[PDB]
């Protein structure tokens, strides 16, 4: 895969940014952020606001100042009642996720604002979503 299958000309821009950041730096983060923007919509599955709040805040709850980063859509979970002070950076946020983070929490970022906050992608988590539909 060498060019996104889409025609979203606000996503030729991101690829024009992270395929510059892939080759002028030594991070395999940018060679993993770029290696996901090419993937089709069924290959970038959604991930909820509860699985993100569960991934960072568990075991020792190491959630100090790391920005969760998913190249997908940050959807919502409403069975989660209280939302922790999180910070995410995805392409799309659903309008019930972006209003359930800001209501008590931190920052919602596009991968633009990520590249001006962690240009080499340090102090981050690079999560995915579950690809498993269990039959489809």
């Amino acid at each position: 895969r060498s060019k996104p299958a889409s025609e979203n000309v606000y996503l030729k821009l991101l690829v024009k940014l992270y395929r510059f950041l892939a080759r002028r730096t030594d991070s395999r983060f940018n060679k993993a952020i770029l290696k996901r923007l090419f993937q089709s919509k069924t290959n970038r599955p959604p991930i909820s606001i509860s699985k993100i709040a569960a991934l960072t805040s568990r075991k020792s709850a190491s959630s100090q100042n790391k920005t969760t980063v998913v190249v997908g859509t940050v959807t919502d979970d409403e069975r989660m009642l209280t939302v922790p002070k999180l910070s995410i950076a995805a392409l799309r946020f659903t309008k019930s996720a972006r209003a359930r983070i800001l209501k008590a929490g931190g920052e919602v970022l596009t991968l633009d604002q990520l590249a001006l906050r962690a240009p080499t992608g340090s102090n981050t988590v690079l999560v995915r979503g579950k690809k498993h539909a269990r039959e489809a």
Partner: protein
């Protein structure tokens, strides 16, 4: 009633409203931060809309010398609201316009160093730098607000010692001139902002302690 004229589309109207702000701001009262955050959304656009390179580099000085017009109590409030409003919307610029919002930052960082020189003749500078340092500890160099971008502080390190020397040609005395940059590289969670900040800074340890 005043700000929405500062964002006019006519330089014969924008500037005509700027000199009357000199009357409006030298008042002897108390101003609340948001009132200086709404006024600083006009002088952003008073400088965002700036055509010529021989006007915007004159407009910056007219904005720089606006600080000594502020009353003594809220003079440090007025710069704190600027560094917030020059760090809240620094990503919205493009390269054809950052070149002119760097010099506004260069002047205001230098305009701070000028006012410490003015305030140093009233009371000892050791407390004046500290409360100025306090303004640096809740504006840019605060750690907990990760949203303050790097491009501000990288340019804030390069102009820190050079426009300390510019306002103090004879000799700048010892104070906590670099204490913002030491508490920043020590615990701030922007990894590059603690790694490459010393590589940009030109700190002078001969006179500081």
């Amino acid at each position: 009633p005043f700000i929405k004229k500062l964002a006019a589309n006519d330089r014969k109207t924008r500037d005509k409203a700027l000199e009357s702000l000199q009357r409006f701001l030298s008042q002897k009262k108390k101003f609340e931060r948001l009132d200086f955050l709404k006024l600083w959304k006009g002088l952003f656009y008073c400088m965002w809309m700036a055509d010529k390179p021989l006007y915007q580099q004159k407009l910056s000085d007219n904005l720089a010398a606006l600080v000594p017009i502020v009353w003594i109590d809220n003079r440090i409030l007025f710069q704190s609201t600027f560094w917030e409003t020059m760090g809240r919307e620094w990503t919205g610029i493009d390269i054809l316009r950052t070149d002119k919002f760097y010099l506004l930052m260069r002047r205001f960082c230098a305009a701070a160093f000028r006012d410490i020189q003015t305030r140093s003749k009233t009371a000892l500078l050791d407390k004046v730098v500290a409360e100025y340092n306090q303004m640096w500890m809740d504006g840019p160099f605060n750690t907990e607000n990760l949203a303050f971008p790097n491009g501000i502080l990288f340019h804030l390190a390069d102009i820190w010692t050079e426009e300390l020397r510019k306002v103090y040609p004879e000799d700048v005395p010892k104070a906590d001139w670099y204490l913002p940059f030491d508490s920043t590289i020590k615990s701030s969670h922007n990894v590059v902002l603690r790694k490459t900040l010393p590589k940009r800074l030109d700190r002078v340890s001969e006179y500081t302690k």
